[PDB]
Structures are given as structure tokens and as C-alpha cells.
Design an enzyme around this catalytic site. Sequence first.
Site, PDB file in Angstrom:
ATOM      1  CB  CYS A  23     -13.492 104.158 -42.674  1.00 19.82           C
ATOM      2  SG  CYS A  23     -13.564 105.878 -43.231  1.00 19.82           S
ATOM      3  N   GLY A  35      -9.404 104.671 -46.619  1.00 18.57           N
ATOM      4  CA  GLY A  35      -9.351 103.237 -46.343  1.00 18.57           C
ATOM      5  C   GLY A  35      -9.115 102.896 -44.872  1.00 18.57           C
ATOM      6  CG  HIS A  81     -19.371 105.372 -43.606  1.00 21.70           C
ATOM      7  ND1 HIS A  81     -18.432 105.116 -44.603  1.00 21.70           N
ATOM      8  CD2 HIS A  81     -18.717 105.711 -42.466  1.00 21.70           C
ATOM      9  CE1 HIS A  81     -17.248 105.245 -44.021  1.00 21.70           C
ATOM     10  NE2 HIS A  81     -17.365 105.613 -42.739  1.00 21.70           N
TER      11      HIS A  81
HETATM   12  C1  LIG Z   1     -10.319 114.031 -48.043  1.00 23.84           C
HETATM   13  N1  LIG Z   1     -10.090 113.032 -49.086  1.00 23.84           N
HETATM   14  C2  LIG Z   1     -10.380 113.498 -50.441  1.00 23.84           C
HETATM   15  C3  LIG Z   1      -9.699 111.763 -48.872  1.00 23.84           C
HETATM   16  O1  LIG Z   1      -9.433 110.999 -49.784  1.00 23.84           O
HETATM   17  C4  LIG Z   1      -9.559 111.280 -47.464  1.00 23.84           C
HETATM   18  C5  LIG Z   1      -8.393 111.518 -46.723  1.00 23.84           C
HETATM   19  C6  LIG Z   1      -8.257 111.035 -45.458  1.00 23.84           C
HETATM   20  C7  LIG Z   1      -9.298 110.301 -44.846  1.00 23.84           C
HETATM   21  C8  LIG Z   1      -9.268 109.905 -43.487  1.00 23.84           C
HETATM   22  N2  LIG Z   1     -10.280 109.333 -42.860  1.00 23.84           N
HETATM   23  C9  LIG Z   1     -11.395 109.104 -43.569  1.00 23.84           C
HETATM   24  C10 LIG Z   1     -11.577 109.413 -44.918  1.00 23.84           C
HETATM   25  N3  LIG Z   1     -12.816 109.428 -45.587  1.00 23.84           N
HETATM   26  C11 LIG Z   1     -14.046 109.651 -45.087  1.00 23.84           C
HETATM   27  O2  LIG Z   1     -14.281 110.520 -44.251  1.00 23.84           O
HETATM   28  C12 LIG Z   1     -15.153 108.788 -45.664  1.00 23.84           C
HETATM   29  C13 LIG Z   1     -16.495 109.422 -45.377  1.00 23.84           C
HETATM   30  C14 LIG Z   1     -16.984 110.447 -46.180  1.00 23.84           C
HETATM   31  C15 LIG Z   1     -18.081 111.199 -45.785  1.00 23.84           C
HETATM   32  C16 LIG Z   1     -18.713 110.934 -44.580  1.00 23.84           C
HETATM   33  C17 LIG Z   1     -18.252 109.883 -43.812  1.00 23.84           C
HETATM   34 CL1  LIG Z   1     -19.016 109.546 -42.283  1.00 23.84          CL
HETATM   35  C18 LIG Z   1     -17.173 109.115 -44.201  1.00 23.84           C
HETATM   36  C19 LIG Z   1     -10.485 110.043 -45.589  1.00 23.84           C
HETATM   37  C20 LIG Z   1     -10.579 110.543 -46.910  1.00 23.84           C
END
Ligand SMILES: CN(C)C(=O)c1ccc2cncc(NC(=O)Cc3cccc(Cl)c3)c2c1
Lengths: 305, 296
Positions: A145, A143, A41
Site C-alpha cells: 500500500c 505491505g 487508511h
Molecule cells: C487479501 N489478503 C488477505 C491479504 O493479505 C492481501 C494480499 C494482497 C494485498 C495487496 N494489496 C493490498 C492489500 N491490502 C489491502 O487492500 C489493505 C486494505 C484493506 C481494506 C481496504 C483498503 Cl482501502 C485497504 C493486500 C492484502
Amino acid sequence: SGFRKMAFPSGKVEGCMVQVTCGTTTLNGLWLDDVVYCPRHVICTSEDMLNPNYEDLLIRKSNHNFLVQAGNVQLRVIGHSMQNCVLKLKVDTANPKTPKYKFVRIQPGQTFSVLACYNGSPSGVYQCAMRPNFTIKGSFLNGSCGSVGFNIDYDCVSFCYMHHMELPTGVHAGTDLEGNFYGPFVDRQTAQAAGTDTTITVNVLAWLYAAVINGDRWFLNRFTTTLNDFNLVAMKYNYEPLTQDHVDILGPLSAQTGIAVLDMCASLKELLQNGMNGRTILGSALLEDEFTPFDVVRQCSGVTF
Amino acid sequence: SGFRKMAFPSGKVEGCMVQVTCGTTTLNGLWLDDVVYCPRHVINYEDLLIRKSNHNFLVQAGNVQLRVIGHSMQNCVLKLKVDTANPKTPKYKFVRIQPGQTFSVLACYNGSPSGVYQCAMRPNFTIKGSFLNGSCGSVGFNIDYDCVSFCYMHHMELPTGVHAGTDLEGNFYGPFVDRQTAQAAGTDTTITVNVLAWLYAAVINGDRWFLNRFTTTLNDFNLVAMKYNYEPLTQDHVDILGPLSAQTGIAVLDMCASLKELLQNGMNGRTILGSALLEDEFTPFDVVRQCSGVTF
Ligand SMILES: CN(C)C(=O)c1ccc2cncc(NC(=O)Cc3cccc(Cl)c3)c2c1
Ligand SMILES: [Cl-]
């Protein structure tokens, strides 16, 4: 004496953490030999996440679109391929700090250490378990990921997890190092939810044997149970079914303490019925399930108190 | 999201762990530049030491044997001058911590690291760690940017299962001595500033059931804290909780009125951040660092 949630020393993994940038997205990568592994991603925008077509997004990219940073040095990308949900970036330099390693896929109930990174920089280490619903109750911010899960046995690092996303309930989902997700999850912004979670019964039992070894027996009773009757009761408290394999695995802990597995199963039945009545077991007011039978033998003394 | 007891990455400390043997005793040492630091009980210590020569101490770093060329004592720590400087020596400081402050422990056996965990210096100067025989010489540390701050060296276990040790200059934390005698940990108290910081971490994570419209004077709270075996909360503690109070919009004396209610009526079958007990091993700085993302 003492019983703590212990993580493996993170040094062998710290030397593999790099920063990957593709366009405006920045996340973590694992550099092993001349390949860098990261979530696919990294090639997506926020809009693309609703229905991403990864094969079409990847074909429009060249090697120089991916920026890989290892500490202060920039690594040059010379190739790229996709394997399930992981992107593999062939780099011109092999990692001199590459440890002896294996990629292993773990089963629910198994534990592992997590090195949480941001911008290819490690910030903390913690221990956790793969839940029965295939999620992890971790501590991750945006961040993170590409942060990884591992076990170290002898001088060999066994990589088992790569972080991909956080779910609406605050729990986390990811893949093994070959890009196959754990659970029914997709790397898409979809209406997916974690299934109902259950307690890892074999792990709670192992933790009760650790309390006996360290010198505590208040929770024991004079009863036994059939394996079938135990599962009839435990299912009513959202506990995972205990199998004959689980009984076989608890054998050495049963032999060391002199308490049969179905006798320990009777104490657990009574503990679920009565609660703790103001008491604690190994400094806890809840029944702990993130310590495997293998972790108890590894951490606890070979001599019972 | 999520809240875990997090330790610092142990890599910079792993590269300093060595095995020390003197006679029949074997324990861990910290190799920094051309000196190895370890508990002096590996050997009237001044009279015991004077008999020994450099070749009596065997120092092993991985597969290589280090040759000892000198030895001196500083309080309860033995300093062994070795002929080789450690190439993996990180940027470091020796610091003495105060009760209530937290740190990471790298538990070793035979100069080989086996695990890492986070813990706090209790008000009674003991640590609730996880140590077996052979762990003596294991160290405690924090990391600030790229600098490792060594704060603890393990020396012994007490009858109740808790642990005691010194700073890196050999001065014990607590009223303990390095010898086989009758020594007991004093009555322990709960670190109040740490419980409050952990309650702010629950409000940041969406847990708000314990909040109320009431406030309290600092004096009225200290009388309730005195009854429940909680450490006195000072004006300095209130000042330290300022940024967490500003970020959530909940004043410190409002969060104290919530703690007063949890001390009297309990949790009523509920949990806070997955716990049925009030947690005190997370400082206000740990809460800010884990809910921000500071890297090393
Ligand atoms: C929930 N919010 C608003 C955060 O800022 C947040 C907070 C904590 C996070 C912790 N891990 C990952 C994160 N992000 C994602 O999951 C990126 C993403 C988005 C959609 C699909 C995929 Cl496969 C990946 C985190 C993101
Ligand atoms: Cl497994």
C-alpha cells in the site's frame, strides 16, 4: 529487433520512497520536497475499515503519532492535512533527491510503470495498463500500500497512481496523487466488485502495427470494414468500442506501414473469428492490449523490416 | 495476488551509465570507480588498439566529459582508465550466469537509460531481448541485498532477432565471436525446471485445473521431455523445487505428471496465469521471491 513489455528506469522514484507508521499499521509514502504523500487508511484499524469516519479519526491525532523513516534517518512530522483519500504529512526536511515532477490523472487504456515497495524499500519494477473497468492487473502483496505508478518523459516524472487495495478477484484499485480514486471504489471494506473487463481495442491494433514493423504480415487479409461494422463485431468479443479519436491516434503507424486503420481493423475481425491456428504474433499466443500507440512508436524502430 | 515479469529496481545501475565515442562509433559504457567498461568493437583487435591513444576515446557522463588516462583489453571488453572516480559507484561483483538463470536489463542509447526489462539466459546462450542500434554496452544484472551482481554486457544482434553478449570479464556466452560473419543461434529448448516453478506459482494463486492424482518416474518424464524439445530434468532440479513442493503439498513428480498431460493434450481453450503458452523465464527463486516480498 525484439518486443518486450518495458518499464521506465525506476531510479528517480526510488529516491522518493519512505516508510510510514501510524499505530500498528505500516505502509509506503512518497517524499517530494517537504511533504510525504500516503493512503489515508494508514490511520485506520481493521475494525474501522467496515465504516471508517476519517475526519473523526484524524482529529484525534497529532504530528508525533506519525513515524516517517527515510532509509536509516527518521523524519520529523510538523503538520498534517487530508486531500480526498490521501494524507499529506508536512516534514521538517526537504528531499534532496526530489526529481522534476507532475501529478497527472490518466484515462483507461493508458500504460505506466509500477515500483512495488514494502516498508519504504523498493523490491521490483513492472509495466501495466489502467483497465477499462478502472482496475490494474498488478502483482502486490500485503505491505505494498502506497506503491506508485509513473511515466518518465524527458527528465520529468509524471506520477499517476498510488496503490490502496486489492479486490476479491485478485485485481488492484487506487487513486491519482490528489486522492481521487480511479473507478467506483471506496477506501472501505465493502461489497464492491470490479465490473466486467473489456479488451483495449486501440492498444491491440497498435501491437498489430508493431508486428508488421518487426516483419510479420501473415494475419493481414484483402478486406476492409466500416468503423460501425467493426464495432458491431468487436462488441461481441468484449472489445472496447473504437472511436474516431482512436483512428486519428493510429495515423502515424498507418502511414509508416502503408496499412490503413480500417484495413488493420479487418485483420483484427478475422483474427477474432479464426484464432491463431498454432501461430504466434511477437512471441504471443494471445492478442496483447497493454501497449499504447505511443509505446509502439517509442520502442519499435522507425524503419519497417 | 497477481503474477508479473518483474525486474530489479534499476537506480544503482543508472548512476553508472556513460556514453563512449571512438571515431564514428558511439555506444554505452559502465563507469565503476575510475574505470569505464565497454565492448572492444568500439575501436585483429590488439593491432587496432596499439595505434590508438587516450585522447581518441571520448567518454561523456551526463553533461561532463571524462578524460581518459589509460587503456587495456581483457578478452572482448575494453577497460578505459578515467581520471575521475564515480561517486555513485555501488557495492558490486562481476558474476558469470548459467543458462536458465534470469536477470534484469537496463537498455541504453548514447549513455542514457531508456527502459528496464526482465529476461533469461536461453539454453542456446542467446537472449530474447529488445534492442535497437546504439544499445551496445547495455548491461544485465541481479541485486542481492545491497550488492549489484553484473552478469551481462550486450554486444550484437543475430539474423533471427535474438541477442548475444559477454560476462563483465569479456568472455562470450555461447559459440559467438565479435565480428561480421555468418553466425546462427543453435536449436533452442524449453527450460523445464522454470516451467514447473511457474506451475507451482499458479497453484499458489488458486489455479489448480491442471492437477491430477497421477505420478511418474523421473526417467519416464525425461523421455516425454526429450520428444517435446524440453531440457532434461535432473535430480538437482527436483531438489531445488523442494520448498515449492512443500508449500503447496504437491510432490515434484506429481507436478511432472501434470506437465506431461499439458504437453500431449494442450490447454483446451484455457489459460494459466493469463497465458496460453507454458512460461519458462521465471526461476524457482523468482517464484519464491515474488510470492514473499524481498526488498532492496
Ligand atoms: C487479501 N489478503 C488477505 C491479504 O493479505 C492481501 C494480499 C494482497 C494485498 C495487496 N494489496 C493490498 C492489500 N491490502 C489491502 O487492500 C489493505 C486494505 C484493506 C481494506 C481496504 C483498503 Cl482501502 C485497504 C493486500 C492484502
Ligand atoms: Cl491519459
